[PDB]
Amino acid sequence: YRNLYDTDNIIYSPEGRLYQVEYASEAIKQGTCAVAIKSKDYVVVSGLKKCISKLSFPQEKIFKIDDYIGISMSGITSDAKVLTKFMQNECLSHKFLYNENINIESLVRSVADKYQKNTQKSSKRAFGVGLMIAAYHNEPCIFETRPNGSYFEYDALSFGARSHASKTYLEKNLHLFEECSLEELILHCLKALKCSLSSESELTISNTALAVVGKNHPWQEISSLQLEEYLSKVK
Amino acid sequence: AGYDLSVSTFSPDGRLYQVEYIYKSINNNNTALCLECKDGIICCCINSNMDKNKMIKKNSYNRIYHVNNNIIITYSGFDGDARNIIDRARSEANTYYYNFHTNIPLHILVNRISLYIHAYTLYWHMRPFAASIIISSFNEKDKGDIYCIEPNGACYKYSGIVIGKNKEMFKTEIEKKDYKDINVRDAIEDIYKFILTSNNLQNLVNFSWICKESSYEFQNIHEEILTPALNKA
Amino acid sequence: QKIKEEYNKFKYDITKQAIESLRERIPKRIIFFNNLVNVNSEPGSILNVNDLDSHKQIYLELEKIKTYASELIEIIGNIKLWIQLNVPRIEDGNNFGVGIQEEAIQELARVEESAFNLYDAIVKYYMERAKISTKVLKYPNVSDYQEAVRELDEKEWIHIKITIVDMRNNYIMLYDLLYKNWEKVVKPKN
Amino acid sequence: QKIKEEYNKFKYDITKQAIESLRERIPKRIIFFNNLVNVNSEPGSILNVNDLDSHKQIYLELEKIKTYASELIEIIGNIKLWIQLNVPRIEDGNNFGVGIQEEAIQELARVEESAFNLYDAIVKYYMERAKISTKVLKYPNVSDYQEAVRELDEKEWIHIKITIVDMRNNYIMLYDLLYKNWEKVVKPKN
Amino acid sequence: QKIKEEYNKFKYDITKQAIESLRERIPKRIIFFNNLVNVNSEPGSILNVNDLDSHKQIYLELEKIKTYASELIEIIGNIKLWIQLNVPRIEDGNNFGVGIQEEAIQELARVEESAFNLYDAIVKYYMERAKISTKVLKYPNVSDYQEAVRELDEKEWIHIKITIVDMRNNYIMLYDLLYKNWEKVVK
Amino acid sequence: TVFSPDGHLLQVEHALEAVKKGGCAVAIKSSNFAVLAVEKKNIPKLQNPKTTEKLIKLDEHNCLAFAGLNADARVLVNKTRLECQRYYLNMDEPAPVDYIAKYVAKVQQKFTHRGGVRPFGIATLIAGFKNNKEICIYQTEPSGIYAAWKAQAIGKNAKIVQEFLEKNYQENMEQKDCIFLALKAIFEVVELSSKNVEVALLTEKDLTFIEEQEINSMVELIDQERT
Amino acid sequence: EYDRGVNTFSPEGRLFQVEYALGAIKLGSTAVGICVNDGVILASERRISSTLIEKDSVEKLLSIDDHIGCAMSGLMADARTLIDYARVECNHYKFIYNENINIKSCVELISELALDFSRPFGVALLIGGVDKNGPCLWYTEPSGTNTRFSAASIGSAQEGAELLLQENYKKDMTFEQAEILALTVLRQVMEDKLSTSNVEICAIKKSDQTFYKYNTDDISRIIDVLP
Secondary structure (H helix, E strand, C coil), X not given: CCCCCXXXXXCCCCCCCCHHHHHXXXXXXXXXXXXXXXXXXXXXXXXECCCCCCCCCCCCCECCCCCCEECECCCCCCCCXXXXXHHHHHHHCHHHHCCCCCCHHHHHHHHHXXXXXXXXXXXXXXXXXXXEEXXXXXXXXXXXXXXXXXXXXXXXXXXXXXXXXXXXXXXXXXXXXXXXXXXXXXXXXXXXXXCXXXXXXXXXXXCEEEEEEECCEEEEECCCCCCCCCCCCCC | CCCCCCCCCCCCCCCCCCCCCCHHHHCCXXXXXXXXXXXXXXXXXXXCCHHHHCCCCCCCCCCCEECCCCCEEECCECXXXXXXXXXXXXXXXXXXXXXXXXXXXXXXXXXXXXXXHHHHHCCCCECCCCECEEEEEECCCCCEEEEEECCCCCCEEECEEECCCCCCCCHHHHCCCCCCCCCHHHHHHHHHHHHHHCCCCCCCCCCCECCCCCCCCCCCCCCCCCCCCCCCC | CHHHHHHHHHHHHHXXXXXXXXXXXXXXXXXXXXXXXXXXXXXXXXXXXCCCCCCHHHHHXXXXXXXXXXXXXXXXXXHHHHHHHCCCCCCCCCCHHHXXXXXXXXXXXXXXXXHHHHHHHHHHHHHHHHHHHHHHHHCCCCHHHHHHHHHHHHHHHHHHHHHHHHHHHHHHHHHHHHHHCHHHHHCCCC | CHHHHHHHHHHHHHHHHHHHHHHHHHHHHHHHXXXXXXXXXXXXXXXXXXXXXXXXXXXXXXXXXXXXXXXXXXXXXXXXXXXXHCCCCCCCCCCHHHHHHHHHHXXXXXXXXXXXXXXXXXXXXXXXXXXXXXXXXXXXXXXXXXXXXXXXXXXXXXXXXXXXXXXXXXXXXXXXXHXXXXXXXXXXXX | CHHHHHHHHHHHHHHHHHHHHHHHHHHHHHHHHHHHCCCCCCCCCCCCCCCCCCCHHHHHXXXXXXXXXXXXXXXXXXXXXXXXXXXXXXXXXXXXXXXXXXXXXHHHHHHHHHHHHHHHHHHHHHHHHHHHHHHHHHCXXXXXXXXXXXXHHHHHHHHHHHHHHHHHHHHHHHHHHHHHCHHHHHC | CCCCCCCCCCXXXXXXXXXHHCXXXXXXXXXXXXXXXXXXXXXXXXXXXXXXXXXXXXXXXXXXXXXXXXXXXXXXXXXXXXXXXXXXXXXXXCCCHHHHHHHHHHHHHHHHHCCCCCCCCECCEEEEECCCCCEEECCXXXXXXXCCXXXXXXXXXXXHHHHHHHHCCCCCCCHHHHHHHHCCCCCCCHHHCCCCEEEEEEECCEEEECXXXXXXXHHHHHHCCCC | CCCCCCCCCCCCCCCCHHHHHHHHCCCCCCEEEEECCCEEEEEECCCCCCCCCXXXXXXXXXXXXXXXXXXXXXXXXXXXHHHHHHHHHHHHHHHHCCCCCCCHHHHHHHHHHCCCCCCCCCECCCCEECCCCCCEEEECCCCCCCEECCEEEECCCHHHHHHHHHCCCCCCCCHHHHHHHHHHXXXXXXXXXXXXXXXXXXXXXXXXXXXXXXXXXXXXHHHCCCC
């Protein structure tokens, strides 16, 4: 427990861990909550903005890559706008060098190496961020990355301050696959935020960004005049 | 105490750390398995990380990569630092195909991948790799050959090898048969019996054999060959 | 199996006592000792010798001290052990929270050991005063021995009250410290 | 919920007393002690023994010291405690302001420790003179014992005045330090 | 607000006394002690016992010692306090000068503690000497007790003069230290 | 050059203390001219010229008087004259003082920001001309900041000499009145001898110096003023 | 502590050099920017040393383009680098494309200069303009995190000036209710008196869309009200 194996990206600990990368995987827990549900043919994303001050407008959490690929960062912002631009340029170039859409599984492999090639060197540090790539190509899939190069084609995710409270809500909810119910799927995803929202506080009055993407749906950002009629007024 | 920080520094007895600590990392992540059979080569992967996630798909975390038609490669350890070697493993097969118009033989691919893994254990600016790669194939006139390239080179040719959190337990169970006996079909039952002994009824494993006289090429199991799994013996 | 049940029961019963002490036992005593030595008091109204007439009055004050000292050791001893039982397996690096736990043990052991030393100090009072009293009996006209008796009681009277202040100040600093560092005391590594 | 109210009221009650003490209680005492040992005196005109005749004269001066010492412990104890209650949760890095807080408590504890030991030291004065005086009564012709009684009181006379200047001097060294570092003691993590 | 005026006046009033000491009070005392123990004296001509006659001679000499000690504590005490009030606000970086200040504080406090302990040490001399003298009356044939009394005076006389040298030497090293680094103690 | 926990710098705060151990220089603006004055001390009986350390020219209408590391000034000046003429070749106009001061301050700012480069330990004050016939005495710093003063002083004890300029600086002085203002600042330099000051009167786009016999007739007035 | 590295992660999951750089924006002069439905007002605070510093030669409201005005704070020696970089990438955008640069597409590139994979920039800007989609006011940080503020304030006194804006802001405010608010908050958090040469405010209306620095003659039109 001499803690000498803690300030470099090259030194390995005697237990086998790499503590400089493990600190970045812990940096995604200090971000706002987010959750994405995968239906049979639709994919939603419930991003919670971080309204810092009273006068300041809330920060943006949900972004866009193409018409069908949309991400939602959860971590520091300085390493999110760089990974978004070094994803969009790897997306529009595929629609320019070729003409079909970019294969979502072949896109994430080019983003995982943006983490991996940024870790092995010593002058460069690991990306402290956690992406949630939500896309639909032929089948709706919800991919996600990590500071360490690792992929898991999920079905229901969570990243955030109270991510464990929303994780438990999806652990006991496996009835999202069979019945799609687009009008009710966003109710489940919005419930995932409300069940883990700042120790019994409301903060859902047009402060939680939503996005839906599916079969004939492009990356439609849910308008501010549509998520508060009944989507935010269920219980 | 002071001689184990960088990788370009030796120890007074003669050993070398920071390439030694990696062995405690590949022996703690999800294990692997690959062993010779009289009909072909059959790999495996035991992703023992259920409890933490439980939300991923059924067969979404696959770890049986291949460079081309008949050479299977698995991992052990860091999933990021192991995919980077696969790109060097795939690009080595393509460079050999451009310059020589032939499939790359295994006794020259495992050497060109060894001088890539080992080359990172020399520069002080870069960190060494964190993966144990299993490389194998099955020729038509010759039997299989599994190369377990560990970190710090050492491309040793094994015949049955496991690398992970139970690298010493399956070796006491693989020796229960020579395996240069009964075919790759019935060997699956013997493999699945080993996993339950050393951990419940979950479909997290994902193996892939190379030969069942199926043009001697790489393929997954099937969804119908996993079903007759003897859950008792 | 009998040993296995009693041990797990033991860890649970302690955990209850630690929370019970922080939610009730320690705050009740905070207000209690504060009601005896109010922070809002004007200077000199607490630490004086104005109400001072063997010294039967001092005896009664020490009896109260012994009650306060006994109950503190029992509560702090169990709360400290509870933090010790919550230290994770020793690992290299990322043990800042273990450092917090050690820091917490350091502050808890310091206050407990300090209060523990009062028991030795009270014995010193009676032994030293009796020895001086023998000298007063042997040499009754050297007035400095009698002045020493007067001054001895006034010193101990002040020390008793400073001890109560030390009680008061330790209880609030300990409760506030655990409150501020609560997330790292329970989950030092998550 | 009543305890939750009573505790929050207490943290507020300290803060009031601390600011009140720095703006009124502490400056008034600085000027007070200064009038007893004026800085403009020529060297040797203060620390002498010309007006020095049990020693009834030393008792009255010692009595004033105990009043000054009592009020000091009460005032210093609450201001020090107030700074202690304002130290934030321990974190890695960006705790330069916490370093100021830690350094200040050490200095604050030093002055408190210095004043606290005077009560025991005065007992030592009577103890040493009484032992030697007994020898003078038993052996009235060994003249060095008679010189020793005179010098011990004269020693305390010198030490008493040095004690009074140190009181004055500790207050100013304490006040200027807290004033200069006032912004980091209240808001240390920005 | 009335105290605030008096307080700023107090901070002003200190500064005057400090400068006065460096230009007059400290150099004059350097020469004073030097006239008692000249550096050009031949070895053994200072630390001797030729001029040594209760011991009334030692008695008269301690009164001078207490005088020398009193003026030292008073002068150094104000100088020590003055440098303490000149320490800047604690800030990160550019506090090399507080380190300079610490060296001054360390040496100033060291000399004061040494001189302060003389008052306790002189009381210790008389207590042990009186006790041994009582034993001589009780045990008149043990000759070493009489030799011990004689030797004690010879020891104390030597200790007295080296103490005066230590006084002299402390004044010069202190004056020399502040003078050379004068620009950094003030600014 | 790495940040500190309080937010300040280290080498930028250290190099700023290096210019304090340098000779005093002072430049005073006027209506249509700007008389400069630099005070330097040498060793007698040797060191033949004045070494022309300060009052360096940069163009036909520029004048720079450094303060600080005497060895590091040549690199900043030779990297200034290289840009004082590169501008003339790319804009066909003589380099105004607004661009030179923005350039000299950029060279020092480019060094404290780079990795593994010691910051410049000098602080110059440029006194040139703008696009029109306006004089603007600028003043750089080792940190990179700069401001167009009207009277400024740098070097050893740059605070009391700067304080004296605030006491008697009028709007538009005359020729001899503006020289006497800068020549009244010899209180900082010991012995006030004429072998220490070296004034230079920059006027109407024609830089000229002042002979040693003229400063004697002006420094002798200080003897009747120091009583 | 782990501040020896230029970019190393903490056990609690945060940076260190970036965290230390945040403690450098609370030392310069204060500033305050207020956004309305038809413009944006940026009120700065001049903290000139003496009468030697020439007025208008030093300022805190640098312009990025003709339609984007911004304030600054922190290390002013390093604030003229991002602004000099914003003055290039914005005019480079006006050459490739032809419309005025949007603030969101300008603040995101000015925050992209905080890449260290040199030491990070200790500058806190207050970019605000009327590019498109109505007037906007942004506030960047040394960490690169940008937020859209309706009425922000940076500088030394930004702790008392932030909540003071929350106690007087109105969504339907006008320029007369904004210019009054942009100066009534500066009189509170101030060490001097708000004279005609202590504020250098500027406003960018929505009608003409061009910035306009308020001279000393028009500054008396607002400071005479004093509600």
